[PDB]
Amino acid sequence: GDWSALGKLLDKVQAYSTAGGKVWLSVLFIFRILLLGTAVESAWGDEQSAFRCNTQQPGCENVCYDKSFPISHVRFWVLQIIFVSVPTLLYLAHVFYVMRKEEKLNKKEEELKMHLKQIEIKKFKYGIEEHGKVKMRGGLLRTYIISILFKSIFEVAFLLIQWYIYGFSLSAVYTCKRDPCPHQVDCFLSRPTEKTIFIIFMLVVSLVSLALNIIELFYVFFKGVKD
Amino acid sequence: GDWSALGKLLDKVQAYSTAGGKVWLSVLFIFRILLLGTAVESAWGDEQSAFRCNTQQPGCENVCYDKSFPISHVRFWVLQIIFVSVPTLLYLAHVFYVMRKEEKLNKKEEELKMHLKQIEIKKFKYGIEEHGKVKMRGGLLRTYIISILFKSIFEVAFLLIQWYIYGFSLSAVYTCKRDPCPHQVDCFLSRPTEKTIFIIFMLVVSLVSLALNIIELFYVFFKGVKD
Amino acid sequence: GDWSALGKLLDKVQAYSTAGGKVWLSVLFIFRILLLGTAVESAWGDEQSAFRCNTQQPGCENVCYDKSFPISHVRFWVLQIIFVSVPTLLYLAHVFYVMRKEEKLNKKEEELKMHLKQIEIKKFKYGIEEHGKVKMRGGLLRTYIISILFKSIFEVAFLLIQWYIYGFSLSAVYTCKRDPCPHQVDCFLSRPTEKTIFIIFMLVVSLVSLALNIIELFYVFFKGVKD
Amino acid sequence: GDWSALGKLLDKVQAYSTAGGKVWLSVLFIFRILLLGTAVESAWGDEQSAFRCNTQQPGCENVCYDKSFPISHVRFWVLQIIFVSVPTLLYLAHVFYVMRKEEKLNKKEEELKMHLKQIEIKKFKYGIEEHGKVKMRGGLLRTYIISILFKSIFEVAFLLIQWYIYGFSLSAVYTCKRDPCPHQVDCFLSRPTEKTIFIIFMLVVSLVSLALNIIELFYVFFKGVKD
Amino acid sequence: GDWSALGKLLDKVQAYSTAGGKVWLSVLFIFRILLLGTAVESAWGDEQSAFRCNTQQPGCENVCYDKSFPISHVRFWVLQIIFVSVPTLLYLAHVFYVMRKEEKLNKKEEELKMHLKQIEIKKFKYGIEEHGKVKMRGGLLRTYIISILFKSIFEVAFLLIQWYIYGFSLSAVYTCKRDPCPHQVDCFLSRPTEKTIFIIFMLVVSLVSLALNIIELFYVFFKGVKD
Amino acid sequence: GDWSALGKLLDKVQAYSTAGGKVWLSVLFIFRILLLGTAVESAWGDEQSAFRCNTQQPGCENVCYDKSFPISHVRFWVLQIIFVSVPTLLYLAHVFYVMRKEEKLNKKEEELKMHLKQIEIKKFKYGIEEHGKVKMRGGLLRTYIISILFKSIFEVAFLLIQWYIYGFSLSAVYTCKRDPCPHQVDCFLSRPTEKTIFIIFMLVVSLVSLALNIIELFYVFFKGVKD
Ligand SMILES: CCCCCCCC(=O)OC[C@H](COP(=O)(O)O[C@@H]1[C@H](O)[C@H](O)[C@@H](OP(=O)(O)O)[C@H](OP(=O)(O)O)[C@H]1O)OC(=O)CCCCCCC
Ligand SMILES: CCCCCCCC(=O)OC[C@H](COP(=O)(O)O[C@@H]1[C@H](O)[C@H](O)[C@@H](OP(=O)(O)O)[C@H](OP(=O)(O)O)[C@H]1O)OC(=O)CCCCCCC
Ligand SMILES: CCCCCCCC(=O)OC[C@H](COP(=O)(O)O[C@@H]1[C@H](O)[C@H](O)[C@@H](OP(=O)(O)O)[C@H](OP(=O)(O)O)[C@H]1O)OC(=O)CCCCCCC
Ligand SMILES: CCCCCCCC(=O)OC[C@H](COP(=O)(O)O[C@@H]1[C@H](O)[C@H](O)[C@@H](OP(=O)(O)O)[C@H](OP(=O)(O)O)[C@H]1O)OC(=O)CCCCCCC
Ligand SMILES: CCCCCCCC(=O)OC[C@H](COP(=O)(O)O[C@@H]1[C@H](O)[C@H](O)[C@@H](OP(=O)(O)O)[C@H](OP(=O)(O)O)[C@H]1O)OC(=O)CCCCCCC
Ligand SMILES: CCCCCCCC(=O)OC[C@H](COP(=O)(O)O[C@@H]1[C@H](O)[C@H](O)[C@@H](OP(=O)(O)O)[C@H](OP(=O)(O)O)[C@H]1O)OC(=O)CCCCCCC
């Protein structure tokens, strides 16, 4: 694949994050990315060539396959993985902006050495005191919360879309009724059992990730209330 | 693929750029390159072998396929990606030229230590004061503006070409009328729905990028007016 | 494949581990990962195309194949390898937490230089004395033991599942009785002998790993009793 | 592919070159190498299997294909790319020889510290004064000019060969007359339109490169006359 | 392939070894690994699809192929390569243990500065005097000898197994007698000549390696007697 | 491919070599390795599936193909490349042995500071004076000459074998006479013209390399006579 850039960026962002965020990144790296690339994507290798129908009408097989699978599961999961990673990058960008502000303020104070008072109050407001121990307060906390909410809503929306379109199982026999197939025809899928097992596994993984980020949100809210 | 060199050059150029430029580079890396390489290009894997027509005339299938698809979408998108990346490299080259001029002027001034006056006026004219904080003024701003305009016009031209040639959807049945096929024949495509979905997705991404660079141009014009 | 990330993490974790753990990691890297990727996975390359049955009823071949192989052995082994590696990562995370606590306590004591007494008692309780010679005592030992137990139970559960589903051999002829195949039909597998040999080899490797981790658990219990 | 070594050597040689040479190297890296590897080579993926003729005489298809395509375009372009890169490596070798001579002369002068006069005259003759600012004078200029001429003549020779053999377009229908095909037969190509488009694109790129190196030669001649 | 980890470990272990061991490692890297990966494994690319028999009885081809090839040569050679590399890793582990003991003893002596006498006698017994010039004496020599013997016996056992199973040549025509094939049938192999040539080449390489390690054992025994 | 290790070793050995040796290494890297991997090996991609004969006798096609091609050209060229690279590695090993001797002698002399006389005479005999400027004298020259002779004889032997077996062209039609084909049959090859062109190209490259190493041998003999 080509997941090198996204993996590198996630490795860059995982340095400064909460424990729940680190666990979420770890499970995303292990189960969502590694498992799909290694063995899951090989199952959908001949979902088109092994598909066949019980007719001799030309062109009915392509129409029935297009009717049966509007979009492959592997591509759907890739799109989901892409769409549940942007807000972390947004948080990384905001952290880098905070770092730039810290560097400029440090340069100004080094130049200086009531200005000390305002420099210190600005360094405390952004949570930059130890030169490498950026804390979450004011803006970073807001960005983190909105990122968590966006990730959760994207995941639940994708899950609902998948539930509406396909369901959570693949029957061994599919009934096709569309031109130019005369009347109704019978078509047979390929590897229904493995696909059902992997779909259930991915559903479980998605639910676990949802619960994990919910726990992370609750913990960060409690930490904010602590102050 | 072989996108390593272009990715490395873009990673080199992203160090000194405006926020809008950085966001544009990020979206180009994520959606334009990564998504196409990972899953999109696999859909157009058997657009030739799965294509079939309702006739037994030899050689009609090849002619009808050539009539239907003058150029594959994947190759068109690759060409578009290549053609909407050169001006950034031109800006990078101009920045490197400015760096070379800065190094030579620094060498001359170190040698010296009214010549100081002209050295300082030349260092201010090119915006080279802090030895690593090159600012946009005079020539760099002009190059940046012309690069943005060239990128925008290339993108809109490619979009217009795609609209004229194909459209934005693929019908499940295609009508073919060309020798040696007798009279008219019916041919059936492969995976119309996935291809339509991905075409719409790419169109949305291109429009978003166009809006982003328009916003970047407006912001840089306002910044120039600020002076 | 894409085993780079997991291999890197295991290379990170192997630095601080017992001898039995190092031997287990070595055998996992050599026989479980390298062997499967190099030659074993190529055997299951045409288990679908070479499968054929003695009938001309349309769609019976797909149904019989789905009946015969609920899940491929290669995917099962990949899932097993993934599921017998998490607790080591958990131990690595706990070790990193101990390192963070050590760094914070060192910072506090450097700041100080009865507080010395409590600093020393906390550094001894976590087994952090030589600044890079973390010892197993109290919590690390408990985490190590529970990780070993979890790994063992996961391995035995996977072995039992494989025994119940398939067995440990593949007969050259399979009997299929499922709709729409009329009455009973005969279907012939592909490369039964190589698959049986590799299944037996993997079973032997799994048993060896089980014995090795049992020995490691006994040795660590004896070491704990030594104190 | 395996273009890593040649790319590394070109990256090594681009450090010391004229602006025209750098632009030529950039366009060679972008359009000649990257574009061909990414998408162009995939078009010629089934030029043999999709080729078919209107006959049932055994062995006529292979003979007609061999008659139609003496050598594939992709292989021809690869050979051209290889044959229009050697003189740059020759220039790199000569530069390395100059560097070796500079190092030996520096060692001899460091040992010494009329010999100073001859050391200085030899350091000026080879254009080695600043220890890392090698200038083009005498021999390097001659090597550069002959390298440019060799590159230009190789490119024009390859272009003429391609014009004589194929032309610049591929007709959808080819007429074959060769044993054992009885009388004349009709054979149909695969993807004529994409191949014609890419051939025209490569021709334009080659012409642009020719013009660029002509401009570089004129500029370097003017620079030589400047002295 | 995935031979990166084993190659890295062998590169780590080759630093401290006898000349015969280094030559054996070099020949193993060149002829056993590189040659098999580059060109040898491509020959066994269609040993299943090109195999065909002279009958129309369904399912006889699979049975006859399974009868003819119990296990492919490429997989057998991969298993042999894996099984003739473990003892070197065991020697590497013992060397690392010696290094750990050396580091601990050095730490204790640095702390000290009759204890000097025992420290020196322990440093001489393990052959650790120059801090990086570990010599073979007592235990390392025993481990080296047993590793050489284990490697030799594994190689000869694999050679005997291959001789018993297949032989050293592949006849162009194979006779098959097994159900459901009626009476006897004739089946034809694929590329017999290349496979025979490569089998003979691998046999010669294995014999050369056996002779080389025998010479290494004799030389190390003579060196031990020298003391 | 897997040419990384051999390429790395050749990159290691090219540091200390004569100009002719460096040119030979460069041409070997460019034309022998890069060209074969990039485009040449793709031509022999379907030399088995596209091969067909004018008969309906079962099993005659495999026999005729085995008769026609005892060993593929690509594998022959890979074997040749492997067999014309060992003596350079032998020279590298001898150079490393000389380096080890130099390091030990330097250690002994540093310890010392008539022994100086013998140390200096041994350092001059092996041509080790400047600590990094090893010269060819006595043994290194002999090893270099024998390596050149071995390389030349291996290349000429491989060329003679290829001339005897195949020739230097491939006719479009092959006549096959071997059981079970009745009487004589006609079989047709695949892509004869491209294969002939590439064979002629490889022959020219081999002759050029032979001439280059002959020139290198003559030059080194003249240099030896110079002393
Ligand atoms: C049931 C768990 C409920 C809490 C779950 C909390 C989340 C969880 O499960 O792991 C993350 C957590 C915090 O780790 P983290 O390093 O971020 O935080 C440490 C500590 O918990 C405080 O946050 C700070 O120290 P102190 O206290 O001011 O001296 C300081 O962090 P910060 O403030 O500078 O950033 C650290 O010393 O790790 C723990 O071990 C918590 C202690 C209890 C671990 C044992 C379980 C009670
Ligand atoms: C609605 C936003 C409209 C503006 C969008 C502007 C574009 C946008 O959305 O992000 C980029 C922007 C500029 O970032 P950047 O680092 O380039 O610029 C900072 C700052 O904005 C000034 O440009 C300079 O400081 P000062 O001011 O002279 O002390 C100095 O940059 P420069 O001059 O040395 O290169 C920096 O401190 O980031 C912000 O946070 C803007 C502040 C407002 C952020 C909050 C929103 C108002
Ligand atoms: C039959 C083997 C039964 C034991 C199997 C034990 C497991 C096994 O087979 O290998 C691991 C083992 C321990 O190695 P490791 O480096 O962890 O431990 C060394 C030593 O054994 C003690 O643990 C400590 O030294 P001391 O003793 O306090 O001076 C110190 O470790 P630690 O305490 O600081 O972490 C080390 O010097 O290696 C051996 O050579 C054991 C000695 C006997 C090797 C010869 C066989 C008796
Ligand atoms: C129409 C252009 C015609 C010329 C095209 C020339 C080719 C072209 O388009 O780009 C390359 C060119 C030379 O760049 P390069 O760094 O090699 O050369 C710089 C300069 O031009 C002189 O060559 C030298 O300085 P000076 O002058 O002695 O103080 C010194 O180089 P050198 O001598 O130590 O190696 C450098 O300062 O870049 C320019 O900006 C030229 C100035 C005009 C740029 C603006 C356009 C006039
Ligand atoms: C027919 C060859 C029979 C012997 C084959 C022996 C094996 C073979 O063919 O290559 C390996 C061999 C030993 O190399 P290696 O570096 O291990 O050993 C060198 C030397 O031979 C002694 O072993 C030691 O020096 P000294 O002697 O105490 O001053 C010291 O090694 P060590 O003791 O510190 O580890 C080294 O100086 O290389 C040679 O050149 C041997 C000399 C003769 C080379 C010329 C042929 C006679
Ligand atoms: C027709 C060519 C016939 C000779 C072909 C010779 C082979 C060829 O074509 O390139 C290699 C050659 C030698 O290069 P290399 O760096 O090995 O050798 C240089 C020099 O030639 C002498 O060998 C030594 O210097 P000096 O002389 O003692 O001060 C010293 O090398 P060494 O001794 O310390 O190792 C070096 O300065 O390069 C040349 O430029 C030769 C000079 C003439 C180049 C111009 C052509 C005459």
mmCIF file of C-alpha atoms in Angstrom, chain A:
data_model
loop_
_atom_site.group_PDB
_atom_site.id
_atom_site.type_symbol
_atom_site.label_atom_id
_atom_site.label_comp_id
_atom_site.label_asym_id
_atom_site.label_seq_id
_atom_site.Cartn_x
_atom_site.Cartn_y
_atom_site.Cartn_z
ATOM 1 C CA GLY A 1 0.000 0.000 0.000
ATOM 2 C CA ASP A 2 0.878 3.677 0.464
ATOM 3 C CA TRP A 3 -0.029 4.201 4.139
ATOM 4 C CA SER A 4 3.527 5.371 4.905
ATOM 5 C CA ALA A 5 2.725 9.100 5.012
ATOM 6 C CA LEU A 6 -0.348 8.802 7.240
ATOM 7 C CA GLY A 7 1.487 6.395 9.538
ATOM 8 C CA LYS A 8 4.425 8.793 9.804
ATOM 9 C CA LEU A 9 2.113 11.701 10.628
ATOM 10 C CA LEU A 10 0.324 9.642 13.288
ATOM 11 C CA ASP A 11 3.703 8.639 14.739
ATOM 12 C CA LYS A 12 4.539 12.347 14.884
ATOM 13 C CA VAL A 13 1.260 13.234 16.610
ATOM 14 C CA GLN A 14 1.253 10.406 19.179
ATOM 15 C CA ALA A 15 4.133 12.008 21.117
ATOM 16 C CA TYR A 16 1.860 14.440 23.008
ATOM 17 C CA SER A 17 -1.533 12.874 23.715
ATOM 18 C CA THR A 18 -3.602 11.466 26.552
ATOM 19 C CA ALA A 19 -3.465 7.786 27.487
ATOM 20 C CA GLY A 20 -6.841 7.097 25.884
ATOM 21 C CA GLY A 21 -5.674 8.774 22.694
ATOM 22 C CA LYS A 22 -2.520 6.657 22.661
ATOM 23 C CA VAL A 23 -4.540 3.462 23.134
ATOM 24 C CA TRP A 24 -6.898 4.523 20.336
ATOM 25 C CA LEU A 25 -3.944 5.201 18.033
ATOM 26 C CA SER A 26 -2.444 1.811 18.904
ATOM 27 C CA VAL A 27 -5.660 -0.093 18.182
ATOM 28 C CA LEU A 28 -6.147 1.884 14.957
ATOM 29 C CA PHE A 29 -2.623 0.971 13.848
ATOM 30 C CA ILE A 30 -2.944 -2.701 14.800
ATOM 31 C CA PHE A 31 -6.472 -3.808 13.936
ATOM 32 C CA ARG A 32 -7.740 -1.207 11.460
ATOM 33 C CA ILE A 33 -4.646 -0.820 9.253
ATOM 34 C CA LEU A 34 -2.352 -3.821 9.702
ATOM 35 C CA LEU A 35 -5.083 -6.475 9.690
ATOM 36 C CA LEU A 36 -6.859 -5.047 6.639
ATOM 37 C CA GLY A 37 -3.643 -4.781 4.633
ATOM 38 C CA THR A 38 -2.248 -8.182 5.587
ATOM 39 C CA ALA A 39 -5.054 -10.694 5.104
ATOM 40 C CA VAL A 40 -8.489 -9.061 4.926
ATOM 41 C CA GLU A 41 -8.006 -7.392 1.536
ATOM 42 C CA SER A 42 -6.936 -10.691 -0.053
ATOM 43 C CA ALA A 43 -10.394 -12.190 0.521
ATOM 44 C CA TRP A 44 -11.958 -9.644 -1.844
ATOM 45 C CA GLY A 45 -9.550 -10.664 -4.596
ATOM 46 C CA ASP A 46 -11.935 -12.450 -6.957
ATOM 47 C CA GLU A 47 -15.358 -11.139 -5.943
ATOM 48 C CA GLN A 48 -15.925 -10.312 -9.636
ATOM 49 C CA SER A 49 -14.470 -13.304 -11.494
ATOM 50 C CA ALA A 50 -15.983 -15.940 -9.188
ATOM 51 C CA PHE A 51 -19.425 -14.304 -9.368
ATOM 52 C CA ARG A 52 -21.719 -16.198 -11.733
ATOM 53 C CA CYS A 53 -25.425 -16.445 -12.526
ATOM 54 C CA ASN A 54 -27.735 -19.178 -13.815
ATOM 55 C CA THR A 55 -28.487 -17.783 -17.260
ATOM 56 C CA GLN A 56 -27.069 -17.513 -20.772
ATOM 57 C CA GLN A 57 -28.386 -14.018 -21.514
ATOM 58 C CA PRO A 58 -25.395 -11.839 -22.499
ATOM 59 C CA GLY A 59 -24.563 -8.993 -20.140
ATOM 60 C CA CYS A 60 -26.801 -10.107 -17.267
ATOM 61 C CA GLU A 61 -23.884 -11.058 -15.001
ATOM 62 C CA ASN A 62 -22.378 -7.553 -14.993
ATOM 63 C CA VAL A 63 -25.759 -5.933 -14.307
ATOM 64 C CA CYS A 64 -26.521 -8.347 -11.467
ATOM 65 C CA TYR A 65 -23.097 -7.818 -9.881
ATOM 66 C CA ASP A 66 -23.507 -4.037 -10.088
ATOM 67 C CA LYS A 67 -26.932 -4.402 -8.472
ATOM 68 C CA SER A 68 -25.605 -6.650 -5.700
ATOM 69 C CA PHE A 69 -22.504 -4.649 -4.667
ATOM 70 C CA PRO A 70 -22.894 -0.864 -4.998
ATOM 71 C CA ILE A 71 -19.479 -0.436 -3.340
ATOM 72 C CA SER A 72 -16.967 -3.006 -2.121
ATOM 73 C CA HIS A 73 -16.437 -3.403 1.615
ATOM 74 C CA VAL A 74 -12.661 -2.922 1.372
ATOM 75 C CA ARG A 75 -13.019 0.479 -0.298
ATOM 76 C CA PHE A 76 -15.693 1.460 2.228
ATOM 77 C CA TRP A 77 -13.379 0.559 5.117
ATOM 78 C CA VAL A 78 -10.480 2.454 3.524
ATOM 79 C CA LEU A 79 -12.682 5.539 3.173
ATOM 80 C CA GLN A 80 -13.805 5.160 6.794
ATOM 81 C CA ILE A 81 -10.204 4.895 8.009
ATOM 82 C CA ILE A 82 -9.292 8.018 6.036
ATOM 83 C CA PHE A 83 -12.322 9.922 7.359
ATOM 84 C CA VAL A 84 -11.660 9.030 11.018
ATOM 85 C CA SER A 85 -8.114 10.433 11.053
ATOM 86 C CA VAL A 86 -8.343 14.112 10.003
ATOM 87 C CA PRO A 87 -9.217 15.696 13.403
ATOM 88 C CA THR A 88 -6.076 14.215 14.971
ATOM 89 C CA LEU A 89 -4.073 15.978 12.256
ATOM 90 C CA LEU A 90 -5.977 19.188 13.021
ATOM 91 C CA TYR A 91 -4.996 18.852 16.683
ATOM 92 C CA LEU A 92 -1.393 18.269 15.585
ATOM 93 C CA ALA A 93 -1.506 21.456 13.500
ATOM 94 C CA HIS A 94 -2.861 23.449 16.444
ATOM 95 C CA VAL A 95 -0.105 22.043 18.675
ATOM 96 C CA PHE A 96 2.491 23.097 16.095
ATOM 97 C CA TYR A 97 0.957 26.583 16.038
ATOM 98 C CA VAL A 98 1.266 26.708 19.835
ATOM 99 C CA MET A 99 4.912 25.646 19.497
ATOM 100 C CA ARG A 100 5.554 28.448 16.993
ATOM 101 C CA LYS A 101 3.973 30.984 19.352
ATOM 102 C CA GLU A 102 6.124 29.628 22.193
ATOM 103 C CA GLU A 103 9.295 29.969 20.118
ATOM 104 C CA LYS A 104 8.481 33.554 19.127
ATOM 105 C CA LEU A 105 7.650 34.532 22.717
ATOM 106 C CA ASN A 106 10.882 32.919 23.936
ATOM 107 C CA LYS A 107 12.821 34.892 21.325
ATOM 108 C CA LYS A 108 11.173 38.135 22.454
ATOM 109 C CA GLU A 109 11.881 37.468 26.125
ATOM 110 C CA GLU A 110 15.496 36.506 25.408
ATOM 111 C CA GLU A 111 15.721 39.845 23.598
ATOM 112 C CA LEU A 112 14.339 41.651 26.649
ATOM 113 C CA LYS A 113 16.839 40.074 29.057
ATOM 114 C CA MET A 114 5.998 45.031 33.146
ATOM 115 C CA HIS A 115 7.021 43.241 29.955
ATOM 116 C CA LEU A 116 8.116 40.238 32.019
ATOM 117 C CA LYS A 117 4.658 40.147 33.618
ATOM 118 C CA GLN A 118 2.833 40.033 30.279
ATOM 119 C CA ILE A 119 5.309 37.504 28.858
ATOM 120 C CA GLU A 120 4.718 35.230 31.852
ATOM 121 C CA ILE A 121 0.935 35.650 31.703
ATOM 122 C CA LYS A 122 0.961 34.776 27.988
ATOM 123 C CA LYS A 123 3.179 31.756 28.647
ATOM 124 C CA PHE A 124 0.816 30.548 31.376
ATOM 125 C CA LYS A 125 -2.317 31.207 29.303
ATOM 126 C CA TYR A 126 -1.094 28.917 26.510
ATOM 127 C CA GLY A 127 0.285 26.449 29.074
ATOM 128 C CA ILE A 128 3.913 26.833 27.958
ATOM 129 C CA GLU A 129 6.154 26.993 31.034
ATOM 130 C CA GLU A 130 8.780 24.224 30.957
ATOM 131 C CA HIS A 131 9.758 24.612 27.266
ATOM 132 C CA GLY A 132 8.506 21.224 26.119
ATOM 133 C CA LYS A 133 5.684 20.443 28.562
ATOM 134 C CA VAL A 134 2.716 21.993 26.759
ATOM 135 C CA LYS A 135 -0.455 21.565 28.822
ATOM 136 C CA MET A 136 -4.087 21.498 27.713
ATOM 137 C CA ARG A 137 -5.890 24.665 28.808
ATOM 138 C CA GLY A 138 -8.323 27.039 27.130
ATOM 139 C CA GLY A 139 -7.905 26.428 23.412
ATOM 140 C CA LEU A 140 -6.167 23.071 23.158
ATOM 141 C CA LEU A 141 -8.855 21.514 25.360
ATOM 142 C CA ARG A 142 -11.603 22.933 23.134
ATOM 143 C CA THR A 143 -9.882 21.655 19.989
ATOM 144 C CA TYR A 144 -9.398 18.226 21.572
ATOM 145 C CA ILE A 145 -13.064 17.989 22.585
ATOM 146 C CA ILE A 146 -14.349 19.063 19.175
ATOM 147 C CA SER A 147 -11.953 16.618 17.478
ATOM 148 C CA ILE A 148 -13.236 13.757 19.644
ATOM 149 C CA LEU A 149 -16.851 14.678 18.877
ATOM 150 C CA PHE A 150 -16.168 14.906 15.136
ATOM 151 C CA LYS A 151 -14.442 11.516 15.140
ATOM 152 C CA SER A 152 -17.333 9.913 17.020
ATOM 153 C CA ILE A 153 -20.012 11.369 14.743
ATOM 154 C CA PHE A 154 -18.098 10.359 11.607
ATOM 155 C CA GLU A 155 -17.753 6.793 12.880
ATOM 156 C CA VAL A 156 -21.428 6.489 13.820
ATOM 157 C CA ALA A 157 -22.496 7.965 10.468
ATOM 158 C CA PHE A 158 -20.369 5.463 8.548
ATOM 159 C CA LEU A 159 -21.741 2.615 10.668
ATOM 160 C CA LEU A 160 -25.327 3.708 9.982
ATOM 161 C CA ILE A 161 -24.638 3.967 6.243
ATOM 162 C CA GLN A 162 -23.179 0.455 6.184
ATOM 163 C CA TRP A 163 -26.142 -0.896 8.157
ATOM 164 C CA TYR A 164 -28.630 0.674 5.746
ATOM 165 C CA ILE A 165 -26.858 -0.429 2.560
ATOM 166 C CA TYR A 166 -25.712 -4.017 3.156
ATOM 167 C CA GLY A 167 -26.574 -5.215 6.648
ATOM 168 C CA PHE A 168 -24.180 -7.485 8.519
ATOM 169 C CA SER A 169 -24.279 -10.776 6.580
ATOM 170 C CA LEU A 170 -24.060 -12.078 3.012
ATOM 171 C CA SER A 171 -26.491 -14.772 1.889
ATOM 172 C CA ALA A 172 -25.060 -17.499 -0.329
ATOM 173 C CA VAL A 173 -27.744 -16.951 -3.007
ATOM 174 C CA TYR A 174 -28.826 -13.582 -4.413
ATOM 175 C CA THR A 175 -31.958 -12.839 -6.441
ATOM 176 C CA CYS A 176 -31.469 -10.477 -9.386
ATOM 177 C CA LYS A 177 -34.256 -8.647 -11.247
ATOM 178 C CA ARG A 178 -32.988 -6.000 -13.677
ATOM 179 C CA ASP A 179 -32.735 -5.579 -17.430
ATOM 180 C CA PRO A 180 -31.700 -7.261 -19.655
ATOM 181 C CA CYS A 181 -32.090 -10.367 -17.459
ATOM 182 C CA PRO A 182 -35.438 -12.001 -18.359
ATOM 183 C CA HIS A 183 -37.804 -12.381 -15.381
ATOM 184 C CA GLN A 184 -35.752 -13.324 -12.273
ATOM 185 C CA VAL A 185 -32.387 -15.087 -12.187
ATOM 186 C CA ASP A 186 -30.273 -16.704 -9.478
ATOM 187 C CA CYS A 187 -26.689 -15.587 -8.848
ATOM 188 C CA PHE A 188 -24.160 -17.051 -6.416
ATOM 189 C CA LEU A 189 -21.628 -15.049 -4.405
ATOM 190 C CA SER A 190 -18.040 -15.987 -3.510
ATOM 191 C CA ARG A 191 -16.757 -16.845 -0.022
ATOM 192 C CA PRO A 192 -19.847 -15.695 1.929
ATOM 193 C CA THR A 193 -18.691 -17.142 5.258
ATOM 194 C CA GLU A 194 -15.278 -15.458 5.423
ATOM 195 C CA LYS A 195 -16.805 -12.135 4.394
ATOM 196 C CA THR A 196 -19.490 -12.397 7.085
ATOM 197 C CA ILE A 197 -16.877 -13.266 9.719
ATOM 198 C CA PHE A 198 -14.675 -10.320 8.754
ATOM 199 C CA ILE A 199 -17.652 -7.934 8.648
ATOM 200 C CA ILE A 200 -18.642 -8.968 12.176
ATOM 201 C CA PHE A 201 -15.029 -8.577 13.316
ATOM 202 C CA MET A 202 -14.807 -5.060 11.871
ATOM 203 C CA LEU A 203 -18.131 -4.133 13.488
ATOM 204 C CA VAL A 204 -16.823 -5.296 16.872
ATOM 205 C CA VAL A 205 -13.598 -3.324 16.390
ATOM 206 C CA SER A 206 -15.534 -0.173 15.475
ATOM 207 C CA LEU A 207 -17.768 -0.515 18.541
ATOM 208 C CA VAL A 208 -14.710 -0.999 20.767
ATOM 209 C CA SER A 209 -13.105 2.138 19.323
ATOM 210 C CA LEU A 210 -16.326 4.098 19.886
ATOM 211 C CA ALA A 211 -16.447 3.013 23.529
ATOM 212 C CA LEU A 212 -12.760 3.854 23.975
ATOM 213 C CA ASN A 213 -13.131 7.405 22.677
ATOM 214 C CA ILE A 214 -16.274 7.883 24.787
ATOM 215 C CA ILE A 215 -14.240 6.883 27.853
ATOM 216 C CA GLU A 216 -11.464 9.264 26.783
ATOM 217 C CA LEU A 217 -13.956 12.132 26.463
ATOM 218 C CA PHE A 218 -15.416 11.414 29.902
ATOM 219 C CA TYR A 219 -11.948 11.269 31.467
ATOM 220 C CA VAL A 220 -10.832 14.532 29.861
ATOM 221 C CA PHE A 221 -14.044 16.238 31.004
ATOM 222 C CA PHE A 222 -13.392 15.039 34.558
ATOM 223 C CA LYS A 223 -9.804 16.304 34.332
ATOM 224 C CA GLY A 224 -11.081 19.690 33.177
ATOM 225 C CA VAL A 225 -13.526 19.804 36.087
ATOM 226 C CA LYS A 226 -10.623 18.977 38.432
ATOM 227 C CA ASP A 227 -9.185 22.473 37.901
#
